[PDB]
Homo-oligomer: A and B are copies of this chain.
Amino acid sequence: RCELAAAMKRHGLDNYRGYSLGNWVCAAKFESNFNTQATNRNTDGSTDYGILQINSRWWCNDGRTPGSRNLCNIPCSALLSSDITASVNCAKKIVSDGNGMNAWVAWRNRCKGTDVQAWIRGCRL
């Protein structure tokens, strides 16, 4: 009787009503906002669920402008956003001349998720 057993038994994640990520290699830029888990059980009442609650009867308004000159108004801009480069500008002249303002340029990645290097020698007679 001779038995040489090899078994790379692999199973994924178990998710039950949620946000789930595994084992990650080479994650350069990541963004994951407002991934909320809510369990609401209500009987004979009112439930209000809120993550971002704004109540503003007057918000970011501009007044009356009789006869002004060269006014600049940028209200409530670039709100709840991402990756904004050289944007929403207000001027008379905008000149871009350099070799700059470069984002995420020329990366070199050599990644591996799972590396298994096994040697199984047995049952010599």
Contacts and interface: CB of A to CB of B under 8 A. Distances in A.
Nearest to A43: B43
Contacts of A51: 34, 36, 50-52
Interface residues of A, number: 125
A74 to B, nearest CB: 5
A93 to B, nearest CB: 5
Contact of A62 (B45, B53, B73, B97): B73
A11 to B, nearest CB: 5
A45 to B, nearest CB: 4
A38 to B, nearest CB: 5
B79 A78 contact: yes
Contact of A8 (B9, B55, B101, B107): B9
